């Protein structure tokens, strides 16, 4: 099966908590992909084998147009190689930083894509747990791709207790030490929508204590440039009570999303 010698190596694309990503071309098919290269002795010394395993298990079994595909994986004496979809437009976070804030069409589009991907995950009892711009890539036509599943879990029955994610995105229930479920992803979607439109997350403060206070109080302060529709969606996602948050099908149906999204599904292989 695969070895490194089956790929032309183009150039590096990014880092990663465990290792480097390269642009690559599978020689047989001239098919352009990305290869994430991990060093086995580094992973063992950091103690992260089981964590890496669970990430591979989750990502390699998801097939959705807005989730970055893992085609296959292989290993040699020293390295593990993950064969990944290439995202030609690159990091979403870089694009938000360059533009400052996204307009309503671009934001709504991304929300429809996010909600569809997340609903795909939830139907399979996968919780993402770290939705934020930095974990998203963009396809050839700008399509959102959920790229990183570092905090993700398969949770078919039990509520979870792990504090995880990113400060500005943490849901109240995490901060409060409660159990959590898939509805954490709803809250993070709401934070994301605000950050896309405003260019800063809603609970931004210089002290972690103040940010946590603002989160558990749901101290949301909408800037005046925001449309009523956008505020309506964010408000319905950022509920203190998990069961009261708008479901992901509800995001895909929300009138602001319908009116503003220009989502296009990529072409798929045809017989």
């Amino acid at each position: 099966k695969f070895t490194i010698d089956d790929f032309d190596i183009g150039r590096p694309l990014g880092k990663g908590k465990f290792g480097n990503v390269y642009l690559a071309r599978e020689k047989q098919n001239k098919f352009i992909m990305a290869l994430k290269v991990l060093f086995k002795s580094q992973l063992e010394k950091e103690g992260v084998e089981h964590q890496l395993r669970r990430e591979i298990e989750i990502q390699s079994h998801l097939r959705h147009p807005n989730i970055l595909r893992m085609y296959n994986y292989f290993h040699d004496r020293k390295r593990i190689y993950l064969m990944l979809e290439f995202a030609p437009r690159g990091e979403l976070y870089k694009e938000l930083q360059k533009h400052g804030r996204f307009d309503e069409q671009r934001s709504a589009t991304f929300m429809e894509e996010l909600a569809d991907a997340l609903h795909y995950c939830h139907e399979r009892k996968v919780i993402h747990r770290d939705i934020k711009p930095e974990n998203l890539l963009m396809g050839y036509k700008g399509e959102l791709k959920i790229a990183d599943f570092g905090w993700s879990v398969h949770a078919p029955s039990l509520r979870r207790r792990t504090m995880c994610g990113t400060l500005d995105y943490l849901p109240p229930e995490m901060i409060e030490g409660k159990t959590h479920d898939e509805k954490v992803d709803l809250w993070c979607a709401g934070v994301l929508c605000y950050e896309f439109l405003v260019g800063m997350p809603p609970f931004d403060s210089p002290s972690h204590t103040e940010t946590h206070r603002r989160i558990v109080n749901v101290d949301l302060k909408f800037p005046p440039f925001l449309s009523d529709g956008s505020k309506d969606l964010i408000s319905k996602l950022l509920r203190y009570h998990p069961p009261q948050r708008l479901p992901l099908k509800g995001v895909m149906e929300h009138p602001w999303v319908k009116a503003n999204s220009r989502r296009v599904l990529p072409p798929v292989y045809q017989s």
């Binding site: 296959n72 040699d76 990529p266 292989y269």
Partner: peptide, 30 residues
Amino acid sequence: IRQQYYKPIDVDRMYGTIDSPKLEELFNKS
């Protein structure tokens, strides 16, 4: 890239059909 976007290959067959190392074995001998 453009070419690949508009003429997608059958990745489920070309790659999703090829053997994968067992996850249990990724840190053992190749």
